[PDB]
Amino acid sequence: MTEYRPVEIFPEVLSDWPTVNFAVTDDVLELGIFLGERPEALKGVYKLIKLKQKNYEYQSFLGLSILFERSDDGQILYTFKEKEVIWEEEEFLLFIGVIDAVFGELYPIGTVVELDLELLDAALVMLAGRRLPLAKDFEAYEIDYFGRVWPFGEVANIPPVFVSNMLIKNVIHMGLENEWEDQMKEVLRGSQLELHQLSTAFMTQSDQVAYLTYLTTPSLR
């Protein structure tokens, strides 16, 4: 209950996720456990998908590295046990999306973080609000964090920043943590997995264009 077991709850949550329609093998389950306990590699692969990079290698703390290439046709390609493994770009983005929904860190309010400038839809941002719901008909997504630029705060001249788990690169100042915060983390994480909510960073191609029309349709009068 209080102790979090993201490893044991990972395989069942992946199967309970309704949008999952790809092959789920033991290696697929093992790949999420490796990337789950190492978000620095999980976020580096998201940049491979979001920024359409050519490849990305994750060097361990020892020195050995693991290569993950991206095909220009829209597909993630790598080799497990020295054997080729294919992953569609729309299916692999959902894979790393559920990992962040399970192995993602819930930072408290007031946590001063440093967003990755390369993933800012193209310095220091304090987290003022977390896990805000999206609009109706888009309950499958959520804004992980959101806040103002530190230390200016709620000055309307400074526009707010929508921060996902993939945008946070470095944590500078941790927020307040106590028994209420841990209770707030538990009751908020369960709803993020119960309603099958993904981060807005893992928005698919069709959901991106459809959400733009949702904004323009009322004014399309």
Read off the amino acid at residue 163: V
Q: Choosing among Cl ion, a second copy, none, which partner's interface includes residue 215 (Cβ < 5 to 8 Å by kind)?
A: a second copy
Please name which of 93, 116, 105 lies closest in space to residue 168, comparing C-alpha atoms.
Answer: 116
Half-sphere CA count of 117, side-chain side, radius 13 A:
2
Query: Residue 176, interface with a second copy (CB under 8 A)?
Result: yes
Query: Residue 135, interface with a second copy (CB under 8 A)?
Result: yes
Nearer to Cl ion, 162 or 211 (CB): 162
Query: Residue 162, interface with Cl ion (CB under 5 A)?
Result: yes
Among all chains, which residue has been given the structure tokens 């497990």? Answer: 80
Q: Choosing among Cl ion, a second copy, none, which partner's interface includes residue 67 (Cβ < 5 to 8 Å by kind)?
A: none
Query: Residue 150, interface with a second copy (CB under 8 A)?
Result: yes
Q: Distance (Å, rounded) from C-alpha 175 to C-alpha 126? A: 9
> Residue from 117, 118, 139, 170 that binds a second copy (CB under 8 A)?
117
Query: Residue 134, interface with a second copy (CB under 8 A)?
Result: yes
* Residue 169, token pair as written in the block: 């690169």
Nearer to Cl ion, 138 or 162 (CB): 162
3-class DSSP string for 149-196:
ECCCCCCCCCCCEEECCCCEEEEEECCCCCHHHHHHHHHHHHHHHHCC
Q: For residue 10, count other CB atoms closer than 10 A to its CB.
A: 19
Query: Residue 211, interface with Cl ion (CB under 5 A)?
Result: no
Shortest separation between residue 149's beta carbon and a second copy, angstroms? 6
Shortest separation between residue 154's beta carbon and a second copy, angstroms? 4
Q: Distance (Å, rounded) from C-alpha 199 to C-alpha 205? A: 14
Q: How many residues bind a second copy (CB under 8 A)?
A: 60
Pick the stretch among 23-31, 49-57, 92-100, 122-130 that binds a second copy (CB under 8 A).
Answer: 122-130
Please name which of 147, 177, 181, 146 lies closest in space to residue 164, comparing C-alpha atoms.
Answer: 146
| Site residues, a second copy (CB under 8 A) | 108-112, 117, 120-121, 123-124, 126-130, 132-136, 143, 146-162, 172-173, 175-176, 178-181, 183-184, 187, 191, 209, 212-213, 215-221
Residues that bind Cl ion (CB under 5 A): 161-162
